C-alpha cells in the first residue's frame, strides 16, 4: 500500500 | 471548511488503505454528508454539478469499503 499512501499523501 | 473536507477525504482513504474499515466508513460517511451540505449552499449550477461528481466518486470508494466489510463479515467463526 505504500505507493497508494504516498499518492494520497501528496 | 473546504480544507476540512479535503482532510477528511484523506483520512478516510488512509484508514481504508490500512484496513481500518470501521474508521474509514466514519470519515467517508462524514465527508459525504459534509460535501452534500456544502453542495447545496452553492448557487452556480455547473459548480454544483462538479461537486456532485466529486461526491459520486467518494461514494464509489465508500461503497467499495462497504462491500469489503460485507465480505469480511461473511467469515463466520
Amino acid at each position: 500500500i505504500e505507493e497508494a499512501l504516498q499518492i494520497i499523501h501528496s | 471548511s473546504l480544507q476540512m473536507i479535503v482532510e477528511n477525504v484523506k483520512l478516510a482513504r488512509e484508514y481504508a488503505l490500512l484496513g481500518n474499515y470501521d474508521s474509514a466508513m466514519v470519515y467517508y460517511q462524514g465527508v459525504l454528508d459534509q460535501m452534500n451540505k456544502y453542495l447545496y449552499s452553492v448557487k452556480d449550477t455547473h459548480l454544483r454539478q462538479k461537486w456532485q461528481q466529486v461526491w459520486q466518486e467518494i461514494n464509489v470508494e465508500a461503497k467499495q469499503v462497504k462491500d469489503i466489510m460485507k465480505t469480511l463479515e461473511s467469515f463466520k467463526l
Binding site: 500500500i1 499518492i7 494520497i8 | 473536507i5 479535503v6 466518486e57 467499495q64
Partner: protein, 170 residues
C-alpha cells in the same frame, strides 16, 4: 481554499483508491471462496499465494479472534508472515503481527517444546516432528527481532515486552 483547487486535490487520488480497493475486494473474495472453519489454513494459503500483505492482514485480523481454529500445520505458514508484519512501518500491521505471534506462542509453544524434547520413538508423527522443528527455527529467528524491539517502550509495557517474556525459553 478555492472550490476548484479543493476538488482537484480530492480527485487526484480517486483512481488509485478505486483500483486498490477493487483489487483488495476481489482478492478477499478469492480467499473467502475456500473458507471453512474446519480448515482455515486453506484460506490462509490462498492469501499467501495472492502475495498481497494487505489481504493477509485482513485475514489475520479475522482468524486472530478464535485461537481454537488454529492447528500446528498453520504455524509454519503464518510465522513468515508474522516476520514481515513485525518489520512493517505501519503500526497496525505490527500490531496484527504481534497478536498472531502471541496466539501462536500461548497455544503452541508448550506442545512444540514437548514434541522436540521427547525421546525418539509413523509418517504422520514424523511430519509433525519436522513441522515442530520448522516452527522452532522460525520462532528462534523471530525472537531476535522481538528482543531488538522489547526495549523501545522503556520503563513502560508494550506488546514486544510481552512477546519477549513469552519467548524467554528460546
Amino acid at each position: 481554499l478555492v472550490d476548484e483547487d479543493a476538488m482537484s486535490q480530492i480527485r487526484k487520488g480517486h483512481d488509485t483508491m478505486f483500483v486498490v480497493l477493487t483489487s483488495r475486494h476481489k482478492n478477499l473474495d478469492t480467499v473467502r471462496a475456500v473458507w471453512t472453519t474446519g480448515d482455515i489454513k486453506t484460506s490462509v494459503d490462498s492469501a499467501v499465494a495472492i502475495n498481497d500483505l494487505s489481504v493477509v492482514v485482513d485475514l489475520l485480523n479475522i482468524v486472530n479472534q478464535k485461537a481454537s481454529l488454529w492447528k500446528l500445520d498453520l504455524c509454519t505458514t503464518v510465522l513468515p508472515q508474522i516476520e514481515k508484519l513485525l518489520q512493517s512501518k505501519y503500526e497496525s500491521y505490527v500490531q496484527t503481527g504481534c497478536t498472531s505471534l502471541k496466539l501462536i506462542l500461548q497455544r503452541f509453544l508448550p506442545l512444540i517444546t514437548d514434541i522436540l524434547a521427547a525421546p525418539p520413538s509413523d509418517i504422520s508423527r514424523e511430519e509433525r516432528l519436522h513441522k515442530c522443528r520448522l516452527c522452532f527455527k522460525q520462532l528462534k529467528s523471530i525472537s531476535g527481532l522481538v528482543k531488538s524491539k522489547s526495549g523501545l517502550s522503556g520503563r513502560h509495557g508494550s506488546a514486544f515486552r510481552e512477546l519477549h517474556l513469552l519467548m524467554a525459553s528460546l
